[PDB]
Amino acid sequence: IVGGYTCGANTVPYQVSLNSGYHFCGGSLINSQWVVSAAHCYKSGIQVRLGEDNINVVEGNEQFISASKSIVHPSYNSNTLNNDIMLIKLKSAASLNSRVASISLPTSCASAGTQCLISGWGNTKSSGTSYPDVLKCLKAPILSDSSCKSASSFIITSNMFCAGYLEGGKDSCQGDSGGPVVCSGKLQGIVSWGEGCAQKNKPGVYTKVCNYVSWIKQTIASN
Ligand SMILES: COC(=O)[C@H](Cc1cccc(C(=N)N)c1)NC(=O)CNS(=O)(=O)c1ccc(C)cc1
């Protein structure tokens, strides 16, 4: 997260860390046994860490659970990152509480100008590198599709949306991928891609979750 603020211990209870010997992507807990992340975060031997704040220090509210099955979206295109969404099922159900809680799926798609919460343990520098140990947060509004294309020249699909500031300075970054974008109390996006970080006229691009609710529900009810 570039230009954000320290969230505060366990203030984002649905935020998860994907670990394969080290943190490599974020994700969101949608129920006691399922996690949603980005398909480009796919990897074998994934361990899900819940209740995390400082990812390098056992603080007491963590739950480390191995994944038993990973399901990348059937139409994921790694070249364009269209349909950049993936489902991860935990070996055993997590114990839900104040510090470990699920986030609800949307019933409608968020609209332009809506303020959302983006979070992750990603890089905090637009130039160079600096990775934080604690969870960072950022408030950012959804942008209109035309305004996004006009300024960035990005080729967006109907399964993506832009959020951030055309002025630059604030944005998600390397390592935040797979993480949550929450608006109106529901999971509306997944950190997917961008061009550099916090660059002017180059806002972040996120997977539009409201288009995948049906797929998610059907997959979870049968796996
Ligand atoms: C990979 O290194 C980076 O600094 C960022 C990471 C990132 C990830 C998710 C969201 C954001 C964000 N801005 N909100 C940033 N991505 C890039 O800079 C990738 N763009 S790119 O122009 O470098 C590029 C384009 C196409 C290919 C095949 C490879 C690389």
Ligand SMILES: [Ca+2]
């Ligand atoms: Ca910890």
